[PDB]
Enzyme design. Structure first.
Site, mmCIF file in Angstrom:
data_model
loop_
_atom_site.group_PDB
_atom_site.id
_atom_site.type_symbol
_atom_site.label_atom_id
_atom_site.label_comp_id
_atom_site.label_asym_id
_atom_site.label_seq_id
_atom_site.Cartn_x
_atom_site.Cartn_y
_atom_site.Cartn_z
ATOM 1 N N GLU H 3 0.775 -1.317 0.098
ATOM 2 C CA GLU H 3 0.136 -0.034 0.190
ATOM 3 C C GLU H 3 0.777 1.219 0.124
ATOM 4 O O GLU H 3 0.727 2.188 0.759
ATOM 5 C CB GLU H 3 -1.047 0.150 1.131
ATOM 6 C CG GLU H 3 -2.458 -1.086 0.800
ATOM 7 C CD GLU H 3 -3.164 -0.414 -0.480
ATOM 8 O OE1 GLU H 3 -3.060 0.756 -0.789
ATOM 9 O OE2 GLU H 3 -4.054 -1.371 -0.999
ATOM 10 N N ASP H 4 1.617 1.468 -0.737
ATOM 11 C CA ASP H 4 2.594 2.433 -1.111
ATOM 12 C C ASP H 4 3.490 2.629 -0.137
ATOM 13 O O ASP H 4 3.797 3.721 0.356
ATOM 14 C CB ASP H 4 1.729 3.601 -1.714
ATOM 15 C CG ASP H 4 1.013 3.712 -3.035
ATOM 16 O OD1 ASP H 4 1.637 3.034 -3.800
ATOM 17 O OD2 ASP H 4 -0.171 4.094 -3.031
ATOM 18 N N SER H 5 4.165 1.517 0.078
ATOM 19 C CA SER H 5 5.009 1.523 1.352
ATOM 20 C C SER H 5 6.346 0.983 0.737
ATOM 21 O O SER H 5 6.425 0.365 -0.422
ATOM 22 C CB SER H 5 4.365 0.566 2.291
ATOM 23 O OG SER H 5 4.938 0.817 3.587
#
Ligand code: ZN
Ligand code: ZN
Ligand code: ZN
EC number: 2.7.7.6
Lengths: 56, 119, 228, 147, 65, 137, 56, 49, 230
Positions: H3-5
């Site tokens: 999740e965009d990590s």
DNA sequence: CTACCGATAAGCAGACGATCCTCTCGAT
RNA sequence: AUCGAGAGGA
């Protein structure tokens, strides 16, 4: 765009983008798609405003 | 239509009726002048139009680098040199017909295959 | 170059498509209303109906256009000479008032002097022509978003706006230190301190800020990266 | 559609033309006012044929003359007769109307009021364009058939 | 900002190769590819270490104080 | 040869020609030079004359400081930043005073200077001068 | 796909000529208006459709 | 890294990966006005304050 | 954009004067119904008069700007079909430079005016660091244009792929438009100059979905680096 | 057969306009 | 410390 003649109605003249992100956009295509993209950003900024008020 | 002006005042001439002789007279109401009418046609409206289609088609039209140039023959200067455009009558319900100009004799021809045409 | 007089002129075609009696009136600055165009044209110099149209419709064969101006002529039939045209506008002293407005406020670009009219008269004809050419649906409404019709104001033009205001407030102040010297005290701070304030804040105005030009024109650069 | 008599396509076209609103303005090419003094005769040579007839199964020298687009006279099922009676029953007894046959070279309607009368005929032609409902229900502009 | 010691990604010392690299480029007129190869930088992570490097220290040293 | 056409490569030669001559913020600098060189003189002439006191040729110094209790120092960008000062030249004008005969040179505030414009010291410093002055080249 | 790229290309290309033809048609005043819409509106409709299908 | 990590190498961080200096500056002056009231820079203590 | 500038604003008065010395009746002497072809002339929205035979007026005007004798930043828009010729010395107009394409060789048949010869002298000057941008501008090899003038010109996109003539293809390459218009007045210096300072860092932007490109330009500004040396 | 009203149309006015957050800068 | 303004984050 001023790279075109007058009264040209063909696909490429008015925003058809024969190419894919892999093949890469042409200069004209790049610009048209830019114009399209802006329109998307605009009403995302406008939607959240509208719906934030509707909700309230 | 065509309407006219006073020879003396140079004002608009308004039509009036002879009655007795059954003929139509324009008269000016600045001075007194009065002439007999040239046509019976007094007023005209046109809703579906033509005028302003071929628009400012003028000598140097060839020099305009932004007009496209087709491969058509020309009906009279049998030349293949021409510039073209869509009806200058910029309005929602105009046809998509092209108008050509024989860059050799300035003869104006059209791509139209349904309509009669006298420009 | 020098002085900013934004006085906007409107030439407006009354009555819709379908509606008859399609008059053309115009808006003049200072003027309490809208005047039929043929009065304007008299008020200038041009009196005879056919010359007025000459100044408007540049083609003798354009019957459609002409036709459209027929109701304009009737509109100004009550007036037939320079002195009474100028009179509608706005003693007798009201004739003077009008004669100035036509030469001081009506289309100030072109000229603002005395001896012209003929030029202001042709330009009005050109505006009218252009308006009609559009109601006749023969050329389109204007693209309000065409970048060739916009201008960017930069450092110069911004600073120049400001300087004028400041330098006039300085100049007005010497007319006041001239009076009190009934029988050399130049407040340099005005220009120094005024120019700082507008460059210090965004407020392109000096102690007004009601002028929402305050929109921060001038803000604190930005050095996070060379690219920023 | 009627539960009938529901998929009968041609029966559905009938209903469309019954409701799709049609103004006279939307069929006229041009309108003209002529000075034509002879109620029995025309300065216009085009007509003439039309003038003898319409005396079979006082006026004014001011003739109002309309021309109707044959092209768009089919895009809606319009006969000269309907177009005429329609005009006729508007002004009822103060406009005398004649018109061309449905399949003539050109389609024309001629009208006379039944002085200062050059100006009254022009106001009529305003009512005539912007106030005559030929057929259909006002407001109901464009109408599409779908399956 | 000076050649970093030790490639980030792997740990091979590269901090002693900046001088030599500048010389293999200027003195023997070599190209960065065969320059890097000759300095014993095979894995492309260490190769990026020197090829990318910008020596800003030179410009810093240029300030008098 | 040399009359030959150009290929798309050769166009960077030209973009390089541009930029070498205009740099990246030219449109800022040109706006300011126009204001100083020409426009500033005009604002002076207009309602200018008084009623009799009239104005004339406007003079723009190189930026300086007014070190309260002390000398007029010549002021450099670096110092201005550090001392929170305003990098700004003084304005001087020719003021004539005509006392009829009948009918019948002057300080005028300080104008802040845009850096690296004509009037600014940095405008024609060589790279080594910039390092000396602590402004980044 | 090597072969797939060729297909995609000759697939757009047909929708190119398919638009050509309609245009060529409209320019010769043989294009008829779809009930209730302008002559030019129907052209845009046709073209926009031939192009969405082309993409899809 | 969902999740965009993202996952980052700690070893290569230690060797200096994506390190930054951070500077902050603080400003101060003595007093604003008065002919007989100036603020002082001094290491202060008591005196009744 | 990279290569764009802003008009500083010259004085109109040499032109007005020059005009009425190359034909052009002033406006008060003008009689419409007897000289209807007369292209009307505007300077800064002021209508000064009319002019029959404007294609030489315009041809002189352009040759004077390209000589230098008329400030390069003045824009001149001849509108053939609208019978108008408009000159702007207005300040604050945005404009961009581009190559001047010219009828050469035979009455074909266009070439760029810059040649290999010109490019060599530019690079002569770069390496020994004589012949500068201004050199190109003064010898009419390059021109300035604002949106208004842009209205009346045909611009190529690349010298080669937009005019070598007609006489096989690589499948990996992006699909080209055409020549399809052979009446050029100007050529783009390079298409990539449509981009600003931030979007210039994006590698392969023509392979990205456009709003992303906008996002990257928001972030390029927020990235740690070395804002200055000092 | 002119006036009086209750009545339907024509016409300028305005109070809103996503949440939370972080920083800095000028002025008082 | 408060009033305003501007920049920016999801
Ligand atoms: Zn008369
Ligand atoms: Zn011919
Ligand atoms: Zn490594």
């Amino acid at each position: 765009l001023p790279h075109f003649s007058k009264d040209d109605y063909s696909p490429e003249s008015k925003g058809f983008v024969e190419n894919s992100y892999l093949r890469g956009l042409t200069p004209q295509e790049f610009f048209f798609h830019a114009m399209g993209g802006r329109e998307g950003l605009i009403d995302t900024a406008v939607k959240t405003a509208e719906t934030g008020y509707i909700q309230r | 239509t065509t309407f006219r002006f006073c020879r003396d005042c140079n004002n608009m001439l308004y039509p009036r009726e002879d009655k007795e002789n059954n003929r139509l007279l324009f008269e000016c109401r600045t001075c007194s002048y009065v002439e007999e009418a040239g046509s019976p046609l007094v007023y005209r409206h046109e809703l579906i139009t033509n005028i302003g289609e071929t628009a400012g088609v003028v000598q140097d039209i060839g020099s305009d680098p932004t007009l496209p140039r087709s491969d058509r023959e020309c009906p009279k200067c049998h030349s293949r040199e021409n510039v073209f455009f869509q009806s200058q009558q910029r309005r929602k319900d105009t046809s998509m017909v092209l108008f050509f100009v024989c860059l050799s004799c300035s003869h104006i021809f059209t791509s139209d295959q349904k309509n009669k045409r006298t420009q | 170059k020098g002085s900013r007089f934004i006085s906007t002129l409107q030439v407006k075609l009354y009555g819709r498509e379908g509606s008859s009696a399609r008059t053309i009136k115009a808006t003049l600055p200072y003027i309490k209303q809208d005047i039929p165009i043929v009065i304007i044209f008299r008020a200038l110099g041009i009196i005879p109906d056919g010359e007025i149209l000459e100044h408007i419709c540049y083609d003798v064969n354009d019957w459609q256009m002409l036709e459209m101006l027929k109701p304009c002529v009737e509109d100004g039939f009550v007036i037939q000479d320079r002195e009474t045209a100028l009179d509608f506008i706005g003693k007798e002293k009201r004739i003077q008032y009008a004669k100035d407005i036509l030469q001081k406020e009506f289309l100030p670009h072109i000229t603002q002097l005395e001896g012209f009219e003929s030029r202001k008269a042709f330009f009005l004809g050109y505006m009218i022509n252009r308006l009609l050419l559009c109601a006749l649906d023969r050329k389109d409404q204007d693209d309000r978003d065409h970048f060739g019709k916009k201008r960017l104001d930069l450092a110069g033009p911004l600073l120049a706006q400001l300087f004028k205001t400041l330098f006039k407030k300085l100049t007005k102040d010497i007319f006041r230190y001239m009076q009190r010297t009934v029988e050399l005290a130049i407040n340099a701070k005005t220009i120094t301190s005024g120019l700082k304030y507008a460059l210090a804040t965004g407020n392109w105005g000096e102690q007004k800020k009601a002028m929402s030009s305050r929109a921060g024109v001038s803000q604190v650069l930005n050095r996070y990266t060379y690219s920023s | 559609l009627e539960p009938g008599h529901a998929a009968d396509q041609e029966q559905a076209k009938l209903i469309r033309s019954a409701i799709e609103h049609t103004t006279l303005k939307s069929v006229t090419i041009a309108s003209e006012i002529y000075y034509d003094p002879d109620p029995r005769s025309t300065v216009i040579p085009e007509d003439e044929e039309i003038i003898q007839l319409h005396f079979s199964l006082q006026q004014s020298p001011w003739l109002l003359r309309l021309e109707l687009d044959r092209a768009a006279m089919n895009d809606k099922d319009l006969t000269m007769g309907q177009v005429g009676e329609r005009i006729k029953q508007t002004f009822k007894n103060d406009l005398f109307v004649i018109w061309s046959e449905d399949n003539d070279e050109k389609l024309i309607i001629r009208c006379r009021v039944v002085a200062e009368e050059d100006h009254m005929l022009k106001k009529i032609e305003n009512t005539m364009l912007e106030n005559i409902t030929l057929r259909g229900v006002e407001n109901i502009e464009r109408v599409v058939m779908m399956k | 900002m000076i050649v970093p010691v030790r490639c980030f990604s792997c740990g091979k010392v590269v901090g002693d190769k900046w001088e030599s690299y500048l010389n293999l480029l200027q003195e023997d007129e070599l190209d960065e590819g065969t320059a890097l190869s000759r300095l014993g930088l095979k894995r492309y992570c260490c190769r990026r270490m020197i090829l990318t490097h910008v020596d800003l220290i030179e410009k810093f040293l240029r300030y008098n104080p | 040869d040399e009359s030959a056409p150009i290929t798309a490569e050769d166009s960077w030669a030209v973009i390089s020609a541009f930029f070498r001559e205009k740099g990246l913020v030219s449109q800022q600098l040109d706006s300011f030079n126009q204001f100083v060189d020409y426009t500033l003189q005009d604002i002076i002439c207009e309602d200018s004359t008084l009623i009799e006191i009239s104005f004339g040729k406007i003079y723009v110094t190189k930026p300086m400081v007014n070190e309260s209790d002390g000398v007029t120092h010549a002021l450099y960008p670096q110092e201005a930043r550090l001392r929170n000062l305003t990098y700004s030249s003084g304005l001087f004008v020719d003021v004539k005073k005509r006392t009829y005969e009948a009918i019948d040179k002057v300080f005028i505030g300080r104008l802040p200077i845009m850096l690296r414009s004509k009037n600014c010291y940095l405008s024609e410093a060589t790279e080594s001068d910039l390092y000396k002055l602590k402004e980044c080249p | 796909d090597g072969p797939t790229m060729r297909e995609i290309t000759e697939t757009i290309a047909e929708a190119k000529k398919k638009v050509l033809d309609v245009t060529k048609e409209a320019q010769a005043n043989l294009l008829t208006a779809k009930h209730g819409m302008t002559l030019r509106e129907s052209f845009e409709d046709n073209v926009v459709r031939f192009l969405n299908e082309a993409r899809d | 890294n969902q999740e965009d990590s993202m996952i980052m190498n700690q070893s290569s961080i230690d060797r200096g990966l994506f390190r930054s200096l951070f500077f902050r500056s603080y400003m101060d002056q003595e007093k604003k006005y008065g002919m007989s009231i100036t603020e002082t820079f001094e290491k202060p203590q008591r005196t009744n304050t | 954009s990279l290569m764009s500038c802003i008009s500083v604003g010259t004085d109109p008065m040499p032109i007005i004067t020059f005009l009425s010395e190359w034909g052009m009746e002033p406006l008060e002497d003008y009689v419409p119904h007897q000289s209807p072809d007369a292209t009307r002339v505007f300077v800064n929205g002021v209508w000064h008069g009319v002019h029959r035979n404007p294609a030489r007026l315009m041809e002189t005007l352009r040759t004077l700007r390209r000589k230098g004798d008329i400030n390069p930043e003045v824009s001149m828009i001849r509108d053939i079909r609208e019978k108008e010729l408009k000159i702007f010395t207005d300040a604050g107009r945005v404009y961009r430079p581009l190559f001047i394409v010219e009828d050469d060789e035979s009455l074909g048949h266009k070439e760029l005016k810059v040649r290999k010869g010109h490019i060599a002298k530019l690079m002569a000057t770069e390496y020994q660091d004589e012949y500068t941008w201004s050199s190109l501008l003064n010898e009419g090899l390059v021109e300035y244009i604002d949106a208004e003038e842009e209205e009346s010109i045909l611009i190529a996109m690349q010298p080669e792929d937009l005019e070598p003539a007609e006489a096989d293809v690589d499948p990996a390459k992006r699909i080209r438009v055409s020549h399809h218009a052979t009446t050029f007045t100007h050529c783009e210096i390079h298409p990539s100059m449509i981009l600003g300072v931030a979007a210039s860092i994006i590698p392969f932007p023509d392979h990205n979905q456009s709003p992303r490109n906008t996002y990257q330009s928001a972030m390029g500004k927020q990235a740690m680096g070395v804002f200055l040396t000092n």
